[PDB]
Each structure stands twice: as C-alpha cells, then as structure tokens.
C-alpha cells in the first residue's frame, strides 16, 4: 500500500493551500484520516461520525476537498511538514508527508 501526495508546496503569506492525499494499491477501507504536524492536530475525518477540526485551526481550515483540507491566511509560522495519517480497517496506518514553505 502506498500514499501519493500533492508534493512539497511553496506559498505566500495570506494565500490558501490545499493539502490532499490519495491511498492507492490497497484492499483496505479507510476508517479515519488524521491531519497532523509533529506536535499538533489540525483535523480528523472519521468515516462513522464526520469531521473534527481542532480549535487552533477552526478560523482557517475547511474540510475538503475529499479527505484533504484547505488552509486559509497562510502565515510564515505554518512553514513545516504536515502528515496525512490514514487509519484503515482494521490493520491500519498508512502515512503521507507534505512540506509547506511560506517566505
């Protein structure tokens, strides 16, 4: 099983960026997708319940497109690497990586 990503992104302050991943080559069903950084939670997409968006990001993150998410009003402090953690039924755990650079 493999994950393909948007690819590393360079954006400017105040811009908007989509972070998306695609799970390929697997017979596994996706129960939940966690969007995270090394130390913080951005959003979770759960198949049974729905989306959860961490209060830190509720002003500038919208669910979608698909199992991805959209960032508004990019700041330089966003510069970092973002993870799309796919939790599949029931073995689980596929991981994708996307670095965003701002200025």
């Amino acid at each position, epitope marked *: 099983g493999t994950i393909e990503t948007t690819g590393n992104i360079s954006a400017e302050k105040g811009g908007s960026i989509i972070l998306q991943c695609h799970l390929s080559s697997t017979t596994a069903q996706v129960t939940q997708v966690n969007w995270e950084q*090394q*130390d*913080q939670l951005l959003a*979770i997409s759960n198949a049974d319940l*729905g989306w959860h968006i961490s209060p*830190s990001f509720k002003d500038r993150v919208a669910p979608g497109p698909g199992l991805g998410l959209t960032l508004q009003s990019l700041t330089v402090n966003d510069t970092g690497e973002y993870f799309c953690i796919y939790h599949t*039924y*029931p*073995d689980g755990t596929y991981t994708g990586r996307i670095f965003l650079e701002v200025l």
Partner: antibody
Amino acid sequence: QVHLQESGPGLVKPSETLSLTCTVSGGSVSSGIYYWSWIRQPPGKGLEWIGYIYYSGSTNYNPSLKSRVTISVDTSKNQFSLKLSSVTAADTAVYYCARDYYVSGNYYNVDYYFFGVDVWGQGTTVTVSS
Amino acid sequence: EIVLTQSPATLSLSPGERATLSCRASQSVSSYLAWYQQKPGQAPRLLIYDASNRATGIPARFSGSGSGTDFTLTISSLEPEDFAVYYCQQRSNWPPLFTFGPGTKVDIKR
C-alpha cells in the same frame, strides 16, 4: 459495523469482585483509533464513567474507583475486560462496554477528547447481594 | 472539579414543537461537550460531539450549540419517538473526566 457484547454474571456477593468481558465484532480491538471503555448506570440514575484501555495496554480510570478497578485487553481473543473488587451495593448497576476515541500524546494543542462514545453494548445488569 | 447541571429536569411538549435542553458547567469546558440520547431499555446514542457537530445519520432536527459554561441541545420539531432522556458529557482534561450530567427527560404531550 462494530458490535459489542457484554458477558459475565449478574449476581456478585458483597466484598467479592465483579468481572465482565466485552467481545468486539465487525472490527478489531487492536485498532489504534479507539479507547475501549466501561460505563455503568445504577438503576434509575445517571451514567458514570469507569475507565478505558488502549490496545497497547495503557489505561485511565475514574479516580473514585481506581483503587479497585483493573481493565485489561486481550488482542487475540478480540476482547477487553473489567474487574472491580470489593464491591458493595453502591456498585449495583447496568454495565456497558463501549467505544471511545484515542487522543495521541503528540498533540500539544489538544487538551480534550474529541468525538464521543459512539458504540455501546447492550449492557448487563449486575446486582451486589448476599 | 467540573460540575455539570441540566435543566429542565423534565419537559412536556407536543409533537411538532421546539424542545430546548440546557447543560451548564461549573467552569468553562469550551467546545468539549457531547450530547447523548437514551430511550427506555436501551444504551445511549451519541447525537452531538464537540458542542455543535451532529453525528452522521442522526436526524437533522437535533442540533447542539453554545460554549464555555452554557450549552443547549435543540430538537427543532419534536417527534413522538423522541421520548427519551438526554445527557450531556464533558470532554475536556479537567479532573472529574467524562462526567455526564443528570439528564433531561422529554415527555410527549398528546
């Protein structure tokens, strides 16, 4: 769909220990998404949280009960269990095994438990009596 | 300790009417509150999570609102099968942990 099923005796004598077991269906108790919880409800009263266990074995119990509660997990039987010792009549209740959601320790910006208890068992009534 | 309170303890409304239930916290718990429904003889069902998000598949007449110390579950148009007890649960990291409220019982007027 995940289906949970409680088992264990309905009568437990005073001072002895209550033991229940929850069997998971249509899903794996090893899934890293979930906390496996126990919640009880004495007749005619509200719901009280007992504790949960993660598939790695780590636990978190209700402080008013932690001196007597031990929740355990068996990954190969697809079961997790609750043992409550030195019971009194205050422990008479319907006991639900249920499903909650895991919060990674890596989230510095998450001081809460997201989602909710979305799957419950049927609950079994245990009465503590002589 | 976090102390949860629910009022009214009892509502009595006719089908089609608006029911508003209130949950309150001794101190703030931000959005970290879920709402549960329990009908006679059954286990609770999760309706609302993180204050305002309705669970998938839940009928759309259930909706949650509020923040901090004052929370509200609204059944916008009561159906008779909504006879049940409704509990709030606090979901923060504050000492009592996973505390449920006392509940509000909604009777149906016919």
